[PDB]
Amino acid sequence: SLSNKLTLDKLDVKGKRVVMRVDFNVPMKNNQITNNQRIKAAVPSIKFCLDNGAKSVVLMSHLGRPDGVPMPDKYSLEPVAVELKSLLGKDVLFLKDCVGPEVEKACANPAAGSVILLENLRFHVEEEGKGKDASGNKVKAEPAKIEAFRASLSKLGDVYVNDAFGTAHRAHSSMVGVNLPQKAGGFLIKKELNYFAKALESPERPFLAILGGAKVADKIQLINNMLDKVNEMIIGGGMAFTFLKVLNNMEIGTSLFDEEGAKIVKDLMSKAEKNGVKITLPVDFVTADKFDENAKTGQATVASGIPAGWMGLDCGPESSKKYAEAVTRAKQIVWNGPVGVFEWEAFARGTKALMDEVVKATSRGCITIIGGGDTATCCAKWNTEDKVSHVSTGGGASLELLEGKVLPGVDALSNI
Ligand SMILES: Nc1ncnc2c1ncn2[C@@H]1O[C@H](COP(=O)(O)OP(=O)(O)O)[C@@H](O)[C@H]1O
Ligand SMILES: [Mg+2]
Ligand SMILES: [Mg+2]
């Protein structure tokens, strides 16, 4: 369950050392930070701890995929300690490791108010439990070593806080291996739990899911689970052409087509009919002569077909209208996946227009939840983060929740 978890607001931190797992996996260009959003996002949990009299806050995270080898020239967290000091108005001590005797001593009984940032957890194979050696071979971590790694992390605080939703789908040492009596979700995780519980357990009605993406076959469990919960579903993006080819015999040109997904389209429509779910597919398209930002563009409908050579890379104006009609009926919306190639301006109108409708919906009291990854990227690109109810901080984690799975990092949190 998402509803029965201990959170930071209910956790007594006064005089306690707080070991906190954060998401500082920020985008980099040669170990310099291009977007600090994820660092700003953790600040409320850190300041709460400091303001409520925590003895220390020890921050642990990963960055990139070092795959269990130390790579401090390429994937060090050191630049984050500088960024964090800017954002907190407080000195941040950066340590060049995250476990072992020197780190445990630094963290044993620090001065009241101390903020410490540890080096990349994924420099140790014991964090993910497997990785690659410098020859590129697979290695798995050894049990006794995983135990020692976990025990060393657990020394660094008296209580544990997880504010890294983006890793909560992974049974990694920092997510599930910290052995302290109280394990609480921080304020980012609290928001994720609150919104996705509402969504998956007791949504407002009508509940609309907006699903986009390239393939059908890798989204079958997502679609199937959402068909158990929703009243309406928009299917957009590249995956729509598989549905349209199968159901209408549409000529789709060089548009994405999922041969294995094609074999289950009617099975999905069948379940939608059985559950009384209204499916809204697109009816018109912006076409491209190739998969390129500066492609020549055209227009098509289902009735016209797409010319051979050409591909549908966005929905068209009548599709936007049908999509807006479903948004207008909704009292709750989950949106996972853009409805066209939003990275390229010529193919971004459908996604921007739908975002405008979703913002207007929120204004009139719709609960609007944006999945992590590409849909969240659109909100940042068009500055709509504060104009929807919730923008999830974890792509892979939000997708696994929406598929109906239990997240090992959430499960590891204390109950009540
Ligand atoms: N009509 C389309 N044709 C091809 N690609 C598309 C289309 N609509 C959206 N996309 C692209 O699909 C990509 C993501 O699809 P997918 O990889 O299944 O989802 P995710 O990124 O969430 O894993 C995005 O980069 C987006 O630009
Ligand atoms: Mg997608
Ligand atoms: Mg895909």
Side-chain angles (χ1 to χ4, degrees), residues 375-387:
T375 332
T377 296
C378 291
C379 295
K381 190 186 285 253
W382 309 320
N383 313 126
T384 57
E385 290 137 303
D386 58 337
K387 309 180 194 292

Side-chain angles (χ1 to χ4, degrees), residues 212-219 239 256 258:
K215 246 117 78 206
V216 181
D218 61 355
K219 283 183 204 73
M239 64 179 177
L256 301 185
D258 185 336

